Design a protein around this ligand. Structure first.
Ligand SMILES: NCCc1ccc(O)c(C2CCCCC2)c1
Length: 370
């Protein structure tokens, strides 16, 4: 219940190319590296010899494959993926010792989806049925896992910023964090939706109507690299970080339109402010705060990209946030826990922090309604 040595260090990746876990599909087992994505709900894998792919799901080789005789099409702003639905037997070698029948989308056509040079071949959507494609009747993987086994209804993620981490399926590993876990309610079970109630740059409040911090929504998404902020909030946030770091920068850098370079080992972390998000707590009028460093929001590509950007889909707490913390997706109790990660990158002056309780009024007003 508190120690899962089998699952520690079961994630791999490359900077900016997401985190992946090893999975097997079909009988006999076909090994595939699968992107871990808490911002989507489909289990989808390359099923055809796309040139970018190390390997792909070969349905003809599996005796346990069952065709659902149904297509699925997933567009993105950029490109897309398209495939054929089926079910097959699925395991996670460095996960719980179980095998489940899950829906799988065999990807037959895609655009700007697979990354040239990456080491993953599919995507594991860990969010809820509501945002599954083509509709909410297509049971997501984790739902299937919980339904078919005795694996507890929760998972946790330690993303360490090439890169590595841990996905603990069915529990929490206490060696992966220090201090205490603090929980924020899952507002609605579709994305992992939460509510930000206050934002501070270097301890200084933005003083914005908190409703705007969640304009549209705020989600925890392991499939996104950046901390993404709603347009208006991003404007204020950049304006504050820009002013907090007026010690040394082009206009395009803040918009993610170009990179900025320093000499090796001369990176001025200290000119940059810490960023705190206060999240709604479990108790009426109670919140807690998570604090990240420039180590998190300045992502190396010594050339770094500013890893905070604007959004029209709301706040996205991507890898920038998540790499500072151990994150518990406590589905059984409709909450997400945050604790200081035992593996986060820091200096001798400042570290990532999770602190509470704080008194925050009108936290319900911060939620944006349709
Ligand atoms: N919900 C979609 C998740 C997703 C799909 C295809 C991708 O190529 C990516 C990459 C974008 C850059 C960051 C790493 C992962 C993410």
């Amino acid at each position: 219940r508190g120690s899962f040595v089998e699952m520690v260090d079961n994630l791999r990746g490359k900077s900016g190319q997401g985190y992946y876990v090893e999975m097997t599909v079909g009988s006999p087992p076909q090994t595939l590296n699968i992107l871990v994505d808490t911002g989507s709900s489909n289990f989808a894998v390359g099923a055809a010899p796309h040139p970018f792919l190390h390997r792909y799901y070969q349905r003809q080789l599996s005796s346990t494959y069952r065709d659902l005789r149904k297509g699925v099409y997933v567009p993105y702003t950029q490109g897309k993926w398209e495939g054929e639905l089926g079910t097959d037997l699925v395991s996670i070698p460095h996960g719980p010792n179980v095998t489940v029948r899950a829906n799988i989308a065999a990807i037959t056509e895609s655009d700007k989806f697979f990354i040239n040079g990456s080491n993953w071949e599919g995507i594991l959507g860990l969010a809820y049925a509501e945002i599954a494609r083509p509709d909410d009747s297509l049971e997501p993987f984790f739902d299937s896992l919980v339904k078919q086994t005795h694996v507890p209804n929760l998972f946790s993620l330690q993303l360490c910023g090439s890169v590595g981490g841990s996905m603990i399926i069915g529990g929490i590993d206490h060696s992966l964090y220090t201090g205490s876990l603090w929980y924020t309610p899952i507002r609605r079970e579709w994305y992992y939706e939460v509510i930000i109630v206050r934002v501070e740059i270097n301890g200084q409040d933005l003083k914005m109507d908190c409703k705007e911090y969640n304009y549209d929504k705020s989600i925890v998404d392991s499939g996104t690299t950046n901390l993404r902020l709603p347009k208006k909030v991003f404007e204020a946030a950049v304006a504050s970080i820009k002013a907090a770091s007026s010690t040394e920068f082009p206009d395009g850098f803040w918009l993610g339109e170009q990179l900025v370079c320093w000499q090796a080992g001369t990176t001025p972390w200290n000119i940059f402010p810490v960023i705190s998000l206060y999240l709604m707590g479990e108790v009426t009028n109670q919140s807690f705060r998570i604090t990240i460093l420039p180590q998190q929001y300045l992502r190396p590509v010594d050339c770094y990209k500013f890893a905070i950007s604007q959004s029209s889909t709301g706040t996205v707490m991507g890898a920038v946030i998540m790499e500072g913390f151990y994150v518990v997706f406590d589905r059984a109790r409709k909450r997400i826990g945050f604790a200081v990660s035992a593996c986060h990158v820091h200096d001798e002056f400042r570290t990532a922090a999770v602190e509470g309780p704080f008194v925050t009024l009108d936290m319900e007003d911060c939620g944006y309604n349709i």
